[PDB]
Design a protein around this ligand. Structure first.
Ligand SMILES: Nc1ncnc2c1ncn2[C@@H]1O[C@H](COP(=O)(O)OP(=O)(O)O)[C@@H](O)[C@H]1O
Ligand SMILES: NC(=O)CC[C@H](N)C(=O)O
Ligand SMILES: [Mg+2]
Ligand SMILES: [Mg+2]
Ligand SMILES: [Mg+2]
Ligand SMILES: [Mg+2]
Length: 1293
């Protein structure tokens, strides 16, 4: 019975929600209050919803709103008791939750809802607390950067205050002289240099009028280091000598040397290289049918960073890092399609409570930034939240910790990552005729595609609210869909030009766009979509609100554009027109004035180039002090370094299967151990051509040797990618992302030497192009600690990402050792240098050491690569794993973990210094070959000049022994399981602190049981028998409705699975049904696909389902469909959730459960073992008793019943169709074998008639054998799961 009060010209309603925190989270709050000496007896939390209404709700509408706001796990309600503390978003902000919840209310016919918002009501019983202690309690319950605490529910009215538009303000240069600019510079935080103030002074003096604030702000954002790249274009003088090239020209040298296969470099916000001719699969604009289009799928690539914002607010910082990079990809050329991501983090020491490591010292930090631990807790969740909700798989990455007091180039100082590296990148595909940006005709319409804006991130950043970003990935997915429809029109693609909206917001993006066409623009401020009516023109034009693009379309294509956008529900606005005159005009219809009126050459005019006159500093290395070092202690420590240690916390939080094109993800083999050295995707759903991505980075090396650190980043990118079938090294293309503390003594000369080392030397010599890259030049943090200045300065940190077209994805090797008769060979590209400076070993004993690794011999590096390519293509490798952090010791350990076996290796040939042989991080790695091939492989390597680098080590053996000898002496010997568990402790402790500790513990303890047989298969049918073939051979192809709501993302691969089984797959959007363009009476089959419809706001699948239920016409249509006597329907993942919420329309579904937040409280992207159980399901005919793995990617997959009576009834009806099993084959509730905590392992149910089946796993992700993370060697093209789609076809007849 809800509250409803006046709220300005509107009315606010208050709707109580469900309990907000599980028992473990409640207990964690209680323990934190107790650890803080706050005497709190109990705490209870409930969601509370606030609906700001523009008109009243009738009783039917009010019941609908109430039902929309019922979602989530059915935790036990408590009557409110104690003190209320309500936590909400800060006044003046609108949560993403709000944007999505409101969209659902509108799509359910509740136009009276102006806005919905959510808070958490905490009820705290703590009668003995003082006022100051209550403030400490409040501090504990909210994020000061994003949220506010209120003492009354009615205080939420504050979130919905209507503000009138703020006017433009002029800066009085004519009336005050230069002082007006000086004042404005400080007031608005423009950070203009003196010569910039000169430039602006003269420009406005010439125009004879005062600049407006907006014009000054625009200019200031455009001329920032972040936007202008002054350092990378500067002239240099080093140790008194003028240099001949800028940094950027040295990078371009690699393209001048090696243009091969490059289609686009340095003229877009991504590079493009040649791909392969394959079947690009999408729905025809006229028919709606999915069809393969044989044509080149070229490959785009991009990598960038979001370091500053992540130090302040890591979740949105990481999230919008991903988001911005995805926009760069989609805005490549005249439109393109992101396809897989990568992720990188560098932080200071974690100092996990209760798990502190011996090398870690708390050196303090600025009060205003978060800790390394907080970045590694919230930041990966943020990045993953964007990749998941947007729907691209995230398939490779790095994570480095570093924070130490070292004697480096500027003597003893603190070096680290208090300002982190937060890196996001990826690959996409693009059509050949869309690679080149088009011309912009005079009179083109200039559009903003995407989200209504707010005053976010203005200028890129008393709290620093301006550095707190905001992410709405489903908005970006809706925009990508439009982009996709555009490029899918081929020659009729209406996009003439497109670009990301990033730094400077529209103030940078729209001038950029018209200027890149040789045009001007005239714009109308009040045509831009806004969610913040109070904004000034400066705020409108300059804010860095997210999920926006700018594009130019011919006027005659507007009607087509509008159709495309409304079908996807992507907001857009025409905001201006391209002009012949090279002028920028922004008009304001509300204030009847002209906030901007400038010639473009004034606006975009440059001050002089920078000159950097700098000097070399070079650290003298100190030999490693080995006093406290033993080999055994060193192994234990190194395996405890986060950089080295298992990465599961960063991997399984992100989807790795959406698209159905993932051939090689991080997790390897039957034991799913995250050690894959590179990512591999197929180019299409009908090819074994593909793409690969790898990363190399070695920043600690730069504390000793700048150039060596850059050469090793390139080298390690190659050694990570080398056991994938590529061929010519010139196919490999690099992104070079440069992170430095420019100005810090020695770093500038170091930067130049490092750019020279790779751009002018190593890359040209190898034939590697760097066609893309970025720079971030303020990687240092300063603060006052007690009475003293403190500073934490990053090493020069180059990150290389390598990208390549792949000739045959099937031939990729992993670190999974075989125990067939074998040989382990080390390829030591260190040539016995065995350097220990700037290694993991040094780091874990708080040292830097003397001399680091380096590329020792350029010809031998190329030789290693070409040798590996020859071995891959000839199928002579059983496994490969490169040497990087932690040395040969860690390479061998990780191979043994992935093969769940032992090794017996001898290192006597590697030098007398066993510590250095085992722990150097020189380039190279370990190949495993069949024992019978040893001599031939050693001869092949010898051809490439490598004989002296090649060393036979020994063999992999069944069992649990990890043994390193030197002739007669045992150097090191341990249980492989003991090592594997130690290596897992970091991810264990991270999971434990972030997720349900019960789940974290179960996952960790499972690794200690060596008897685990790994994923394994039992098949009740012949996976090669195409039971649909006789039907397909008739040419009669039944339609399937491939149903998608906004935010759904696994529809293309779902279509292709049905297509292979003989269906004509039709793209049916929920907008198609709502608009009359499709009726389900024309179909015999329907599938509800996976994704994040409405970002799962109001419960996964809930908005989708309730939008059906609350439209009587569409509801009737679905009901009619399900009540027909022979129709078939399938719901997968989000579609499973949707159909579970739609069960009142589905006969025989009365016993179905709900699907809710996983027990782990975390998204689970796993390759899990299931068994097919006896049920009516017509889609699982022939498969009962089969056990095989399947892709799982969900956060809300836990079966929830009303009570045991309901579970028992469901079970006794026999409607359960799939169950999770552990690797021993038993039905399980233990995690992560059962990833979500479903009772009795339930993960699929069917109806009484078998005609409708719903399941949480994704059969469409894995119907192709090549897209199964691990599979039996003997499978052909089809996996077991292809049988589901074939059964559907045969059932139809
Ligand atoms: N930030 C991250 N996000 C996702 N995957 C990651 C991340 N860091 C590491 N990985 C994955 O974990 C595995 C081990 O990483 P790492 O040991 O850094 O690789 P390598 O030593 O081969 O360069 C690899 O498959 C890698 O792609
Ligand atoms: N891939 C999917 O369909 C995921 C479903 C939903 N977004 C969840 O996380 O539970
Ligand atoms: Mg590693
Ligand atoms: Mg590697
Ligand atoms: Mg690495
Ligand atoms: Mg066993």
């Amino acid at each position: 019975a809800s509250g409803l009060v006046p709220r300005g010209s509107h009315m606010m309603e208050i709707l109580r929600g469900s309990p907000a925190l599980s028992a473990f989270r409640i207990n964690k709050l209680l323990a934190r209050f107790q650890a803080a000496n706050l005497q709190v007896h109990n705490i209870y939390a409930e969601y509370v919803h606030f609906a700001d209404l523009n008109a009243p709700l009738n009783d039917s509408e009010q019941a609908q709103l109430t039902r929309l706001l019922q979602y989530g796990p059915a935790l036990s309600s408590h009557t409110p008791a104690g003190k209320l503390l309500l936590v909400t978003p800060r006044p003046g902000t609108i949560s993403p939750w709000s944007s999505k919840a409101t969209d659902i209310a509108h799509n359910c016919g509740l136009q009276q809802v102006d806005r919905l918002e959510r808070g958490v009501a905490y009820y705290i019983e703590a009668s003995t607390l003082t006022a100051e202690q209550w403030r400490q309690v409040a501090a504990e319950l909210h994020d000061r950067m994003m949220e506010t605490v209120f003492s009354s529910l009615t205080d939420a009215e504050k979130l919905f205050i209507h503000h009138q538009p703020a006017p433009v303000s002029s800066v009085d240069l004519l009336g005050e002289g230069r002082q007006a600019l000086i004042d404005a510079n400080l007031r608005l935080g423009l950070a203009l240099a003196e010569d910039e103030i000169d430039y602006l002074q003269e420009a406005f003096t010439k125009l004879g009028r005062n600049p407006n604030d907006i014009e000054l702000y625009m200019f200031a954002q455009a001329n920032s280091e972040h936007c202008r790249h002054k350092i990378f274009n500067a002239d240099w003088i080093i140790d008194g000598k003028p240099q001949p090239k800028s940094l950027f020209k040295m990078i371009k040298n690699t393209f001048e040397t090696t243009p091969d296969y490059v289609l686009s470099a340095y003229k877009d916000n991504a590079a493009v290289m040649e791909g392969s001719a394959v079947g690009r699969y999408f729905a025809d604009h006229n028919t709606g049918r999915y069809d393969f289009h044989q044509e080149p799928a070229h490959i785009l690539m991009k990598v960038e960073t979001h370091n500053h914002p992540t130090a302040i607010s890591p979740w949105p910082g990481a999230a919008t890092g991903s988001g911005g990079e995805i926009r760069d990809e989609g805005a490549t050329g005249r439109g393109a399609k992101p396809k897989a991501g990568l992720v990188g983090f560098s932080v200071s020491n974690l100092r996990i409570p209760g798990f502190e490591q011996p090398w870690e010292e708390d050196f303090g930090k600025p009060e205003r930034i978060v800790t390394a631990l907080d970045i590694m807790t919230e930041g990966p969740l943020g990045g993953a939240a964007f990749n998941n909700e947007f729907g691209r798989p995230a398939l490779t990455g790095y994570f480095r910790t570093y924070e130490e007091k070292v004697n480096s180039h500027n003597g003893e100082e603190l070096r680290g990552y208090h300002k982190p590296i937060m890196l996001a990148g990826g690959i996409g595909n693009i059509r050949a005729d869309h690679v080149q940006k088009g011309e912009i005709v005079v009179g083109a319409k200039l559009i903003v595609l995407g989200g209504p804006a707010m005053n976010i991130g203005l200028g890129g950043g008393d709290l620093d609210f301006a550095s707190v970003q905001r992410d709405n990935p489903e908005m970006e997915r809706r925009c990508q869909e439009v982009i996709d429809r555009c490029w899918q029109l081929g020659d009729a693609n209406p996009i003439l030009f497109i670009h990301d909206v990033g730094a400077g917001g529209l103030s940078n993006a729209m001038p950029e766009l018209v200027s890149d066409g040789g045009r001007g623009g005239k714009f109308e401020l009040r045509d831009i979509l806004s969610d913040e009516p109070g904004m000034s023109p400066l705020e409108i034009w300059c804010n860095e609100s997210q999920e926006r693009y700018v594009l130019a379309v011919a006027a005659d294509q507007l009607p087509l554009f509008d159709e495309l956008c409304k079908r996807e529900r992507a907001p857009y606005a025409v905001i201006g027109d391209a002009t012949e005159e090279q002028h920028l005009s922004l008009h304001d219809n509300h204030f009847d004035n002209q906030p901007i009126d400038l010639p473009l050459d004034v606006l975009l005019g440059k001050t002089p180039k920078m000159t950097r006159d700098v000097q070399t500093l070079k650290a003298k290395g100190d030999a490693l002090n080995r006093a406290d070092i033993t080999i055994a202690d060193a192994v234990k420590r190194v395996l405890h370094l986060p950089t080295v240690a298992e990465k599961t916390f960063l991997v399984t939080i992100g989807d790795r299967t959406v698209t159905g094109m993932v051939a090689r993800d991080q997790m390897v083999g039957p034991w799913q151990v995250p050690v894959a050295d590179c990512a591999v995707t197929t180019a299409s759903l009908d090819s074994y051509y593909g793409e690969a991505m790898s990363i190399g980075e070695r920043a600690p090396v730069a504390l000793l040797d700048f150039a060596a650190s850059a050469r090793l980043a390139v080298g390690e990118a190659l050694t990570n990618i080398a056991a994938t079938q590529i061929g010519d090294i010139k196919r490999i293309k690099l992104s070079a992302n440069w992170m430095a503390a420019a100005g810090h003594p020695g770093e500038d000369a170091g930067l130049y030497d490092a750019v020279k080392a790779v751009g002018e030397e190593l890359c040209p010599q190898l034939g590697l192009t760097i066609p893309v890259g970025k720079d971030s030049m303020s990687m240092k943090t300063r603060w006052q600690e007690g009475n003293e200045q403190r500073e934490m300065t990053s090493p020069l940190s180059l990150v290389i990402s390598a990208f390549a077209r792949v000739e045959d994805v099937r031939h990729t090797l992993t670190p999974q050792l075989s125990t067939e008769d074998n040989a382990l060979l080390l390829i030591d590209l260190g040539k016995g240098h065995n350097a220990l400076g700037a290694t993991a070993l040094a780091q874990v004993y708080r040292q830097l050491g003397d001399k680091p690794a380096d590329v020792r011999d350029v010809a031998q590096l190329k030789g290693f690569y070409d040798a590996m390519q020859a071995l891959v293509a000839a199928r002579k490798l059983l496994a490969w794993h490169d040497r990087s952090d932690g040395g040969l010791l860690v390479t061998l350990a990780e191979m043994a973990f992935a093969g769940h076996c032992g090794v017996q290796v001898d290192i006597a040939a590697l030098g007398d210094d066993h510590l250095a042989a085992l722990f150097n991080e020189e380039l190279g790695g370990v190949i495993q070959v069949r024992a019978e091939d040893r001599d031939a492989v050693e001869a092949l390597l010898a051809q490439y000049g490598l004989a002296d680098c090649v060393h036979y080590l020994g063999q992999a053996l069944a069992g649990d022994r990890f043994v390193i000898t030197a002739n007669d002496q045992t150097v090191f010997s341990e249980s492989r399981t003991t090592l594997r568990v130690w290596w897992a402790e970091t991810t264990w402790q991270m999971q434990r602190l972030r997720d349900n500790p019960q789940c974290a513990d179960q996952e960790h303890e499972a690794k200690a049981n060596d008897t685990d047989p790994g994923l394994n298969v039992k098949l009740s049918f012949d996976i090669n028998e195409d039971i649909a073939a006789p039907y397909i051979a008739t040419g009669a192809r039944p339609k399937v409705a491939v149903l998608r709501e906004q935010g759904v993302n696994s529809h293309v691969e779902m279509a292709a699975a049905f297509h292979r089984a003989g269906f004509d797959a039709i793209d049916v959007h929920m907008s198609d049904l709502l608009g009359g363009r499709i009726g389900l009476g024309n179909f015999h089959a329907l599938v509800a696909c996976g994704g994040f419809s409405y970002g799962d706001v109001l419960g996964a699948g809930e908005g989708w389902a309730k939008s059906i239920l609350f439209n009587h016409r569409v509801r009737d249509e679905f009901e009619t469909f399900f009540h027909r006597p022979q129709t078939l329907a399938l719901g997968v993942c989000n579609g499973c959730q949707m159909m579970s919420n739609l069960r009142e329309l589905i006969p025989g579904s009365e016993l179905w459960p709900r699907f809710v937040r996983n027990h782990s409280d975390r998204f689970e992207a796993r390759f899990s073992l299931v068994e097919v159980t006896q049920s009516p399901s017509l889609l699982l005919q022939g498969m009962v008793g089969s056990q095989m793995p399947i892709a799982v990617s969900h956060g809300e997959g836990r079966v929830e019943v009303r009570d045991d009576a309901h579970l028992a009834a469901l079970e006794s009806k026999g409607l359960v169709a799939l169950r999770y099993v552990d690797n021993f084959g038993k039905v399980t509730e233990t995690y992560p074998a059962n990833p979500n905590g479903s009772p009795n392992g339930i993960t699929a149910v069917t109806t009484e008639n078998g005609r409708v089946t719903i399941m949480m796993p994704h059969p469409e992700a894995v119907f192709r054998t090549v897209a199964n993370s691990w599979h039996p060697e003997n499978w052909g093209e089809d996996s077991p799961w292809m049988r589901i789609f074939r059964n559907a076809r045969k059932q139809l007849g």
